[PDB]
Every structure is written in structure tokens, then in C-alpha cells.
């Protein structure tokens, strides 16, 4: 398997730990999920409600359910943002 393969796969099943066996992402284990993932992120953000602030507006946020499509929208906003500062600054 090429790296991209197991990277996409990680994108897949990392969502599956905290989506529960229910299939929808709750707000709470969404909090836990995002927390599990990023070392230098949630501490930097001062707002203690930050994860919940992220929950809204995100693809379908309105019911307490976030699908894989929506979580992937989180990855879209985030990972595109990263690459931009990679270009206009690091590159």
C-alpha cells in the first residue's frame, strides 16, 4: 500500500472510533475525537468552547449528527488552510 492509501484509510477509521456504533457523530465524542488527534492545536485556541464552535456551520451541523462527509469537511477547511500557509509562507 502506498502512503496515500493508509492515510486515506486513517481518515476513514479514525472517524469510526468516535462516531460510536450509532453511525452519527455526537457533539461530545466529537470533542473527544478532535482532542485525540491534534497536539499543538486545541491548547493554542483560548476559547474553551472551541470544539463546539467548530461543530456548527460544518457541512451538516444542525442535528446533533455529523456524518463522515461533514467531518471530512472539517479536514477540508483545516488541511487546505495548512497548505496555504505552507505556500505563501513556508514554500
Amino acid at each position: 500500500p502506498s502512503q496515500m492509501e493508509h492515510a486515506m484509510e486513517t481518515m476513514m477509521f479514525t472517524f469510526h472510533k468516535f462516531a460510536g456504533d450509532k453511525g452519527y457523530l455526537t457533539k461530545e465524542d466529537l470533542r473527544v475525537l478532535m482532542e485525540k488527534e491534534f497536539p499543538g492545536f486545541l491548547e493554542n485556541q483560548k476559547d474553551p468552547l472551541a470544539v463546539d464552535k467548530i461543530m456548527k456551520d460544518l457541512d451538516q451541523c444542525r442535528d446533533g449528527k455529523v456524518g463522515f462527509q461533514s467531518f471530512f469537511s472539517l479536514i477540508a477547511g483545516l488541511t487546505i488552510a495548512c497548505n496555504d500557509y505552507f505556500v505563501v509562507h513556508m514554500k
Binding site: F38, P39, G40, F41, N44, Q45, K46, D47, P48, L49, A50, K53, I54, L78, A81, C82, N83, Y85, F86, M90
Partner: protein
């Protein structure tokens, strides 16, 4: 894992749990959208004859955080920097103001300190104004942002741009190592200090300046307020008048502002603001820096002291000493009438 760096610079907003400081005259806009505001500034610049009113109304009604949002959306929409898009569309005092409104607090002080820095031979009043009025945290960020912008430390600049005891004084203050003094209050030390200040200047001919420098940089504001009071027991002169007699030049001006700052800081700006418009014309440089820098911090209280001493509101003076789009800008930063 290079991403771990880049990602760690990223933020949502952040949605602010933070207050605009209470005494601020500028408050975070009620229903905010950075995208439409960017559109409207863009629309106002690319309009023939530069709709200024719209650029001014929007920016002076946004808090500093919202301006930085707007200035961001402006980049990704237009691919141009908002700062220089406005540098060309605007002129005169209005440009100076709007330009400063766009900078973050520490970005704006360092920029002012830097601009004032360069000179043999430079503007000490600015240097003195900023360094004597800024708190430990406020200063700490100046230094951090100075370094990032100019690649040299604010300390070396002061060193190369000053001399004598004035140098020693401005270097000491600029460190933002001042004591915090809390609930516990040292009456033993207050007295000790009061007598040292006198033992240094008035009691003798000549002056021991580092004595004055150590005490007035190191001790806390609250503590220094009590020292300046106790001093009156040992001295025929209050701290201000004593300064006038003992020392002269940049040093004296530096010391005077410093005491005012420790005694009543808002009133210090009021006086500064008053001196700026009091003559024929106006000194717009002092005026602008204060209206921009204090807008989000103590402005309400400066206004409270400004009506006390001068009998008229700040709003009155701005209106009287300036006109046009420039005036309206200063007025929004003012916050209202007293």
C-alpha cells in the same frame, strides 16, 4: 511532520470569550461578517473618487479583531493586501488613522516606536509616551512583535537611538519587568523609597539618577503612588516639581510623563490629547496615536478625566480642531459625548 507547525498557527476565529476591556470606546460589532465588509471596502476603493465614508464607517465601527478578519477576507478575495490597497486610495491624516486602526495593538506600538526610533536624533516624546505608558504584558508583546518585524530587539534600538541616563531609563522601562504589588503592602519600603528619592534629588546638590531610575522602574504602580505621597513628608516639593528642579532635557520629560502615568494614567492621556489641539492648529501625530491606541483600552476614562479638567468633552475638541472624514474617524474612536 511539518504540518504540525503550520497547523499550530491556525485558528477558527477564535470566538472570543474575552472582553474589550470595559473602559474601551470601541466594541466588537454586533452582527459581524468579515466577507461582506471586505466586499464593501473593495467596492468603495474601486469606486470612482474613493467612497471614503464607507471605508471609515466600517473600520472604525469594527474592533481590532474584526479589522484583522476583514483584512484577511480582503486578501483571499482580492489577492491584494488591504494595508497597501488603502495606502493608495487614502491621503493625509485619514490615511494615517485608518492605517493605524488596521494594525494590532503591539504591531502599532512597535511601528510607532520604530518610526520614532530612527534619528540621531529622533522623536523622544513618542518614545517616552509609549514606553512610560505601557504595562508589563503590553511591553512584552511589543518586543516580540518588534523582533519579528525588524529582526533586531527593541532594546538594541533604544541603545543605539539614545544616550546618557535617558537611555538607562528607557532601557529599564522597556523590559516590562515591573513589580506587580498585590494585596500585601510594604509600608517599610514605601518610606525607604520616599526618603531615597529625596536623598537623591532635593536634599542634595547634584542628583543620583540611577537611584531614581531603579525605584521608579522596579516598584509597582500602587506602591509608587504611596511613595509619591509619603515623599511630601520629606520634601517641600511634590514628585513632579522636584523633577523639574533636579533634571532637564529628554530625561526630565521622560520622568514627568512617567510619574503622571503612575499617578493617573487616563488623565495623562487627557492632558496629552489636550496639549495636541490646544494651540493654533493641532498635532495630529500625538492625537491619532492616542485615539487609536487607547480606543479599546481606557478611552472611556480618558474621556471621564477630560471633561473634569477642561470642562468640555473630548468630542467637543476633536470636532473643533479637525474637520472632514478625518474628524468623523476620530469621533467614532472617541465613542460619544460626555
Amino acid at each position: 511532520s511539518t504540518v504540525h507547525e503550520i497547523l499550530c498557527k491556525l485558528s477558527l476565529e477564535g470566538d472570543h470569550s474575552t472582553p474589550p476591556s470595559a473602559y474601551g470606546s470601541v466594541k466588537p460589532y454586533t452582527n459581524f461578517d468579515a466577507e461582506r465588509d471586505a466586499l464593501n471596502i473593495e467596492t468603495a476603493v474601486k469606486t470612482k473618487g474613493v467612497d471614503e465614508v464607507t471605508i471609515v464607517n466600517i473600520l472604525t465601527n469594527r474592533s481590532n479583531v474584526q479589522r484583522q478578519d476583514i483584512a484577511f477576507a480582503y486578501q483571499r478575495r482580492t489577492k491584494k493586501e488591504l494595508p497597501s490597497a488603502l495606502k493608495s486610495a487614502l491621503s493625509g491624516h485619514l490615511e494615517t488613522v485608518i492605517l493605524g486602526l488596521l494594525k494590532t495593538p503591539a504591531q502599532y506600538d512597535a511601528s510607532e516606536l520604530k518610526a520614532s526610533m530612527k534619528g540621531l536624533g529622533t522623536d523622544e516624546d513618542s518614545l517616552i509616551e509609549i514606553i512610560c505608558s505601557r504595562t508589563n504584558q503590553e511591553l512584552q508583546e511589543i518586543n516580540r512583535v518588534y523582533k519579528e518585524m525588524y529582526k533586531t530587539d527593541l532594546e538594541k534600538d533604544i541603545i543605539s537611538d539614545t544616550s546618557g541616563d535617558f537611555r538607562k531609563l528607557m532601557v529599564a522601562l522597556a523590559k516590562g519587568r515591573r513589580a506587580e504589588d498585590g494585596s500585601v503592602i510594604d509600608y517599610e519600603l514605601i518610606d525607604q523609597d520616599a526618603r531615597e528619592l529625596y536623598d537623591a534629588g532635593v536634599k542634595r546638590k547634584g542628583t543620583d539618577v540611577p537611584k531614581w531610575i531603579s525605584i521608579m522602574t522596579e516598584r509597582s504602580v500602587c506602591h509608587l503612588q504611596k511613595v509619591f505621597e509619603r515623599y511630601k513628608s520629606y520634601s517641600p516639593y511634590d514628585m513632579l516639581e522636584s523633577i523639574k528642579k533636579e533634571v532637564k532635557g529628554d530625561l526630565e520629560n521622560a520622568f514627568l510623563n512617567l510619574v503622571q502615568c503612575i499617578q493617573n494614567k487616563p488623565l495623562y492621556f487627557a492632558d496629552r490629547l489636550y496639549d495636541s489641539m490646544k494651540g493654533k492648529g493641532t498635532r495630529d501625530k500625538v492625537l491619532i496615536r492616542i485615539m487609536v491606541s487607547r480606543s479599546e483600552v481606557d478611552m472611556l476614562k480618558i474621556r471621564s478625566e477630560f471633561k473634569r479638567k477642561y470642562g468640555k468633552s473630548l468630542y467637543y475638541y476633536i470636532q473643533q480642531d479637525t474637520k472632514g472624514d478625518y474628524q468623523k474617524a476620530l469621533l467614532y474612536l472617541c465613542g460619544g459625548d460626555d
